[PDB]
Structures are given as C-alpha cells and as structure tokens.
Amino acid sequence: SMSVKKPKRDDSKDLALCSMILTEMETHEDAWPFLLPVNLKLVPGYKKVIKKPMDFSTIREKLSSGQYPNLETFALDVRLVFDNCETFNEDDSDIGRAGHNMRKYFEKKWTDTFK
Amino acid sequence: SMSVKKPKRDDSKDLALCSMILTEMETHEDAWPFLLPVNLKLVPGYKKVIKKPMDFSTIREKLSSGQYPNLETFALDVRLVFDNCETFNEDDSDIGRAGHNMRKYFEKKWTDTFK
Ligand SMILES: N/C(=N/O)c1ccc(F)cc1
Numbered sequence: 191s192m193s194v195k196k197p198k199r200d201d202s203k204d205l206a207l208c209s210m211i212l213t214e215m216e217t218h219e220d221a222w223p224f225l226l227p228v229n230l231k232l233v234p235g236y237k238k239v240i241k242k243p244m245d246f247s248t249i250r251e252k253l254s255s256g257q258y259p260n261l262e263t264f265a266l267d268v269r270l271v272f273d274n275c276e277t278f279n280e281d282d283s284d285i286g287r288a289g290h291n292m293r294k295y296f297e298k299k300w301t302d303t304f305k
Numbered sequence: 306s307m308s309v310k311k312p313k314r315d316d317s318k319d320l321a322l323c324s325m326i327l328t329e330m331e332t333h334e335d336a337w338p339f340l341l342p343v344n345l346k347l348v349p350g351y352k353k354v355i356k357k358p359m360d361f362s363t364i365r366e367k368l369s370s371g372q373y374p375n376l377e378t379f380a381l382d383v384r385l386v387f388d389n390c391e392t393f394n395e396d397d398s399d400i401g402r403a404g405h406n407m408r409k410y411f412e413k414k415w416t417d418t419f420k
C-alpha cells in the first residue's frame with residue numbers, strides 16, 4: 191500500500207525476454223495457424239464468434255511499439271491466441287492439436303524464463 | 306510500458322505526509338461537519354442520496370490500516386467528503402461554506418506538500 195512496497199523485481203530485461211519467447215513461438219513448426227490474423231471476410235463465423243482476435247504478428251507489433259505495460263498483459267494476449275483456437279476448433283483436428291501443442295510450449299518457456 | 310519506466314519517485318514518506326495533512330484537516334475549526342460518519346438512521350435522505358459516504362475518521366482508519374494503495378486514492382476519499390457535502394448542502398449554509406473552506410484548505414496543503 192502507500193509507502194509499503196515489496197522488494198523491487200528487476201524488470202529491465204522483460205521486454206527482450208518476451209521478444210525472445212515470441213520468436214521461439216513464431217519459429218515453432220506448428221505456429222502456422224497463429225502467425226497472421228484470421229481474414230474475417232473469408233472465414234465464416236469467426237468475426238461474430240471470436241470477440242477478441244489475436245495472433246503472433248499482432249502480438250509482435252504490440253510488443254515492438256510499447257503496447258504491453260507489463261509481463262502479465264503479454265501473456266494474456268498469447269493465451270488469448272490459444273483460447274480462441276479452442277473456441278473455433280475441435281481438439282481432434284490439426285489446428286486444434288497445434289493450439290494445444292503451442293500452449294504447452296509457451297507455458298513452459300514462460301515458467302523457465304520467469305518462474 | 307514493459308521495461309520502460311519513468312525515474313522512480315521516492316514515495317517512502319507519503320503515508321506520514323498524508324497523515325500529517327489529515328491531522329491538519331481534523332484540527333481545522335470548520336472540520337466538525339466531517340469528523341464522523343453521518344448517522345444514516347437519523348438523517349433523512351442521506352443514505353439514498355449519498356452513494357458513497359465518507360468522513361475524516363473513516364479516512365483515518367483506512368490510512369492507518371493500509372487501505373490506500375497510493376496518494377491518488379487518499380486524495381479521492383478526501384475530495385469525496387466535500388463532493389458529498391456539496392450534494393447535500395446549499396452553498397449558502399454553515400455546512401456548505403465549511404465544505405468549500407475545507408476543500409480549499411486541503412487542495413493547498415496537497416499542492417504545497419507534493420507539487
Ligand atoms: N478448420 C479450419 N480448417 O482450415 C479453419 C480454417 C480457418 C480458420 F480460421 C480456422 C479453422
């Protein structure tokens with residue numbers, strides 16, 4: 191609270207580390223469903239169903255332009271990518287499996303980097 | 306944003322300084338309408354009209370128990386006291402004038418202490 195602070199965590203490397211993790215996500219062989227935004231004019235249902243579209247290239251543009259105020263908000267967008275994927279894809283499909291794989295991939299990198 | 310911070314303002318004295326200012330408010334001769342919470346069972350209209358009652362003793366209890374996370378939230382409660390006063394009192398009344406006087410009194414102390 192006021193004048194009562196926890197010891198300051200050094201966050202000076204967070205931006206670089208998030209960029210690193212995002213690069214690993216981007217280069218994963220199962221990243222292809224998530225690299226670019228879904229074309230809302232070509233994919234039936236997506237615009238009405240998915241209230242907050244997100245993809246790696248958008249995350250990258252936000253990261254590169256200071257639109258994440260902290261670690262937590264970066265992770266939220268990354269997880270949003272896979273939450274959307276689950277909403278729109280059967281688990282038993284190529285894209286469904288990709289999402290599950292990439293989520294697991296992210297969460298371990300996330301833990302190994304900060305936890 | 307992430308890994309981009311303004312120079313750290315030293316906030317270690319804010320709690321003591323807010324307490325000091327609150328003490329000056331409390332001891333002002335026109336503090337009497339604001340020292341204690343309005344009795345909602347004895348004052349017609351107040352409970353239905355004033356959605357967020359606030360008074361100095363409540364501010365003091367919050368301050369003393371770490372319920373203000375920062376300067377801004379302390380000032381918000383103080384100003385709420387006088388906003389409520391304006392809502393429920395004619396400017397041309399003793400309590401109305403008290404509120405205006407105490408608000409001016411606060412805002413100068415506030416500026417002189419932090420600005
Ligand atoms: N099930 C799909 N197969 O291509 C699919 C196509 C486009 C999408 F945006 C999501 C899923």
Ligand SMILES: N/C(=N/O)c1ccc(F)cc1
Binds near residue numbers: 343351394398400
């Ligand atoms: N006008 C008033 N006179 O006592 C007044 C009384 C009680 C209040 F809570 C506010 C105002």
